[PDB]
Structure formats: C-alpha cells, structure tokens
Symmetry: C3
Subunit: 246 residues, 3 copies
C-alpha cells in the first residue's frame, strides 16, 4: 500500500495529459524515493522517462515498493476532474485499483482499475551527443508550432555560436534562430557542428508540457536521437529520447 499527496490537482492532470498524448499504458513504480515511469510511444520512436521525487509531494508514504500498470487515457480523464486548488491523493491498498481522491470543499474519490503492463526490455545504445542547448520554453514551443505550419520535419543545427531550427515544405519555409545575444538561449555547448532532423508531430506533443519560462535542455548529435529534458515543479524531471528522421 501507499499514499501520496500532491497539492494542486490540475497541475498533476496536465502532466499526465502531456504524457498520455504519446503513451497509452505505463508502469509507474512507487518507491521511498519517488515515482518513476519509463515507456515508449506506440511507434517506438519516443522514450519517456518521468521522475517525481518525494519532495514534490505534500505527504509521501510508500510502505512497500510497488509497480502499477495504468491506462493513461483513463488516468487522464479522471485527473481532469481535479481543480487548480484541489488536493490530490493517490492511494493503493492491496486490491488492483488506484484510489484517486480530490479534496476541496468535499472529498471525491475515484476507483481506477489497474492493468498488467510488461516493463521495458531496455537496450539503450551509448549516446555520445555533441551538442547541448539550453533554451527558454517559449522559443521551443513557438518554433515547433512554426515548423508544423510548414512541414512534417524539422532540422536542428548547432554551431559554436548559434542554434537553428529549420523546416521546409512544398511552398513555405521557416527558420528559428538563436545566438547567445538572444534572451531565448541560456546555454550552448557544441563539440562539433551538429545536425539532425526529427518528426514534428512528436515534437508538438513533447512541448505541450513546457511552461514559457522553463529552462529546456536539448542534447543531440549528428543523425542521432534528441534528448529533451525539463522540470516539473522544479525537482520532478521529464525526459524524452526521440529517434532521428533520416
């Protein structure tokens, strides 16, 4: 059994909504440390890694370490009942359901049946990325949306002093550019001129959970996967690994 409590139910709902666009079923592992979940999208192109440490919860009691399998759409639909100011309680007793309770002026408790999800057969290659870019959330969210207007593919180019996202359709073309003079670009570390391209329909989902003022970390390499990392409630970490399009 466990009980974990999170203040601000909507914010937790938004996090599961983000992940649920990419992931249909996920194993969430509860330990004394926090909650972890690792899962691939249906095309097996994006890996999601979510870490929610104890410190982001108001009360956190994991009496025994336990992994539960969750339908993400169903989980999202329930969480969406939560208000911005609801307190959210997730509690598991021995039965195969998760109790999900919202506390405000009343106590409203849902029962979500759990499912059997087989955990990832992980064979991640070494990822010797050659470029790291830290940019403001707003730039990345804007840029992806700009590129989706234009193409189904977006190219990322990192050079010593500039980060460029470029996309080209039949008719239209966009280029989003960033040098260290721009407010949007917080850090750029480039070992070597680095270029790779990615499917935008994945990127469009990945960036939905980003706040405008978030620092977002990108790590990538030449025709290599993109690693995209950002924080949830400062200490929670949401990490995507996205296969390249080439």
């Amino acid at each position: 059994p466990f009980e974990v409590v999170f203040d601000g139910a909507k914010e937790f709902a938004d996090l599961i909504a983000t992940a649920s666009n990419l992931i249909d079923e996920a194993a969430f592992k509860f330990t004394e440390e926090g909650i972890s979940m690792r899962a691939m999208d249906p095309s097996r192109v994006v890996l999601i890694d979510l870490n929610l440490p104890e410190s982001i919860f108001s009360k956190y009691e994991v009496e025994e370490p336990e992994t539960i399998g969750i339908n993400m759409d169903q989980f999202k639909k329930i969480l969406k009942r939560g208000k911005a100011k609801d307190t959210l309680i997730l509690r598991k007793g021995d039965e195969n359901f998760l109790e999900i309770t919202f506390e405000g002026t009343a106590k409203r408790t849902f029962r979500l049946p759990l499912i059997d999800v087989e955990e990832l057969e992980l064979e991640l290659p070494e990822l010797p990325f050659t470029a790291k870019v830290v940019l403001l959330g707003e730039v990345l969210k804007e840029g992806i949306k700009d590129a989706s207007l234009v193409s189904d593919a977006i190219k990322f180019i990192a050079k010593e002093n500039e980060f460029t996202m470029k996309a080209e359709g039949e008719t239209n073309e966009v280029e989003i550019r960033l040098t260290l003079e721009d407010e949007g670009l917080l850090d750029l570390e480039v070992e070597e001129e680095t270029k790779s391209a990615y499917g935008i329909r994945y990127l469009s989902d990945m960036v939905k959970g980003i706040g405008k003022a978030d620092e977002v970390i990108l790590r990538f390499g030449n025709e290599m996967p993109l690693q995209m990392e950002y924080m949830i409630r400062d200490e929670g970490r949401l990490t995507f690994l996205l296969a390249p399009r080439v």
Copy 2:
C-alpha cells in the same frame, strides 16, 4: 400589456438557457406579484417551477395578468444577444409577440412570435421526503460531472451524519462524500436513512444554472423524486422535481 425590466441581460439569458436544455415550450404567467412558469421536460421525468418575483426587476408593470407561450430555444437565441451590462426590457402589447429590447449605447428591439402552449394538467402526489440536504453549489456541480464520467446513474444516500453521491460504471466508480465537517455541507436533516437513484443526464442540465457559492436545497426520499431548489438573484426561485431511476 406589461413591461418588465431586468438589469443585466446576460444573467437572464443564462437562466432561460438552463431551462431551455430541459424545456422546449413554456407558459409564462405574468401577474402583479412576479412571473411564474411551470413545465415538464419531453420525457416527462423533470418538472420545472420558476418564480421570478417583482423584486428582482428594476421596473415592473403588469397592467393586466397574462400568460404567454414561448418557444424556449428561440427565446434563448435572442436573449443570448444581450451583454452582461445590457438592460433587458420585456414588453407585451396586445399583438401576439413579445418585444425583447436590449438597452446599452443603442436600443435593440426584437419581436418574438408567441405560441399556444396548453398549461399543465397537474396531479402531483404527496411528497413525504425524509431527507433534506443543503450543500454548496460547487460540490453538486462537481459531483454530477464526476458521476457522468463514470455512469448514466447516480445514487444519493443520506444518513444522520453524512450525504453520499455514488456512481458505478462497467469499469470506473466514484463516491462524493460530505459530513458536517466539510465546507460543502451547510445543513443535513434526515428522518430516516434515505436512498434513491437518478438519471445523470437530467442532473447535468439541472446543475448548469447553479453558481459555485449558491446554497442548493435537496429534498428526497427512498425511491422517491428528488426536489432541487436554488435561488436566482437571491429572491427568484428555480425548483426541479426529478423522478427516480429504479
């Protein structure tokens, strides 16, 4: 002829919108006291009783007592043209149309044809309810929406010290609970342990017109109709009687 004037056209529009989800055609009776309307939904499961006393109108002149029949959808579509700060004037001369005028920076006058509506052949049984619950509007609106996620039916249970709404679908389940310790519960009077169940699709419409901070009165009995009462502009009263599902 009559002329009644209501300050804040949108608020009047919202009231007719609420009722129009359940009622297609209604007889509104204008007297010196105020306006009354009583009507059943098309399934003959919900009775609506609306009372709008003189005191909620800025100017109120009913020269002769008169009942008019109104298509509610049409009435709603026109009222929806009104702005939050429009003044609304309803005036009837001898012709079979209602003049509906919005006054702001201009005077905009609609003509709504009236129709012949046969008034209710009322045979209401005695309703010896055994439970009264007064709760905050927000709890009832939340709870119904929670239950609609889960089921087409909702069960209400009232005991001496707790009010519970419960719903169960194929897969999901919710329970909304209230004791006198909760802010949501303002009054509970229970003669006898009381249980009844109701169609949620009716309840979902009934609660649309409720403000978050409204006191809502429920009266019900074992496998008996639910009476749901709340106020409009403090002195206007909107009362539903809803047949049980059993």
Copy 3:
C-alpha cells in the same frame, strides 16, 4: 527591396485575418508614403481599400516602390504565429518571396512565395451619397449580429434625427435604433431620407475588424452602395464599398 517593421504582430495578423475573410489574393503596393491595397471579394460585391501609412510602422524603408501579390489565407496563417508583443518585420529582397520575421526572445523568419495578381480594372461610378452616419463600433458590430440571427438582409434607414437598421425573417424581426441622444451615435448628416438594403454575410465580415470604441463612418444613398470606413492604429484606414441588395 524594402523593410517595414510593425510593433505588435497580433494586431497586424488580425487586420489581414479580417480582410482575408473577403479577399483571397491581393496586390499590396509599397511606396515611400505607406502600403496600399485595393481588391474585390470573389462575388464582386465588396471592394476593399486599405491604407497603411508610414506613421503606423516603427521603421519604414521602401528603397524602391514595388507591388507584390499575396495569397491572403497563407499570409494570414503565418501572421497568426505572431504574439501580441512580437515585433513584425516584412522584408523583400529581389527574389519572389516576402520574408516575414517575428522578433521576441528569438528571431523567427518565414518565407512566403509571392504570386502574380492582376490589378483592378477600376471603373467606379460617382457615388453621391445622401447620408453620413458616424457610430460607435460596438453598435454596428452588435446590430449586424442581431440582424444575422433574424435574416440574410438588413435595411439601413437614415432620417434627419435617427439612424435605423432593420431586418426581418420568416418568423423573427429586429430593429436597432439610434438618435443623437444615444451614446452609440456620434454624428448624423442626412440630406434626404435615405434607405438601402445590404447582404448581412458581407456586413458580418466587414465588422470583425472593428474595435468596440472605434468611430465608424457609414456613407450611403437610396438603393446605393454603402461606404464603411474605420481606422487602424488611428492613421491606417480600412474602407469597404458594398453593393446594395435590391
């Protein structure tokens, strides 16, 4: 080549969105004075005349006078990427594309291909209007929407001391009236009692670009076109000429 810069990208987007509801392809002529565009809708019922003087731009450099042909839907889709606080830059080099750049925390540059648009074979008759009405934007926007509820046609009537818009459907009817006592009516000049009627589906698009507090000028005549003029950023001028319905 030219470069013109406009502070507040959304506001420019809203202007092109307004025009794009009526106009599919337009020739924009850039001179030292400002930008002008004149075009007819596909039914050849509405003429649009837009004038954007230098003074509404933050920086304005037109090195050579040049006319470019623009697909308005495409232009609108790109401009819609702009934020309220983006700076917008339109720049043309010798190639047949317009560069459209949004500058905020990053610099985002789109390429829009240009097209060949044959310029208007203008034979405008003399328009001896007999009525001028200056009214508040809010009244005109409300009134058109009121009339569209009711009919596909709206009649405008101007007399010495009153302006009336009237519409009549099968069942419903509206009348929007204005005398100089109303706040909505800023100026009325009538040579002669003046009546004309117009298609509302045109008027509904024409009024979308009007702010609530705008002074809007109407000039019309008996069974004559309506001239509707209002300002953009105080000095830019948007003028429609709309053929009568009779």
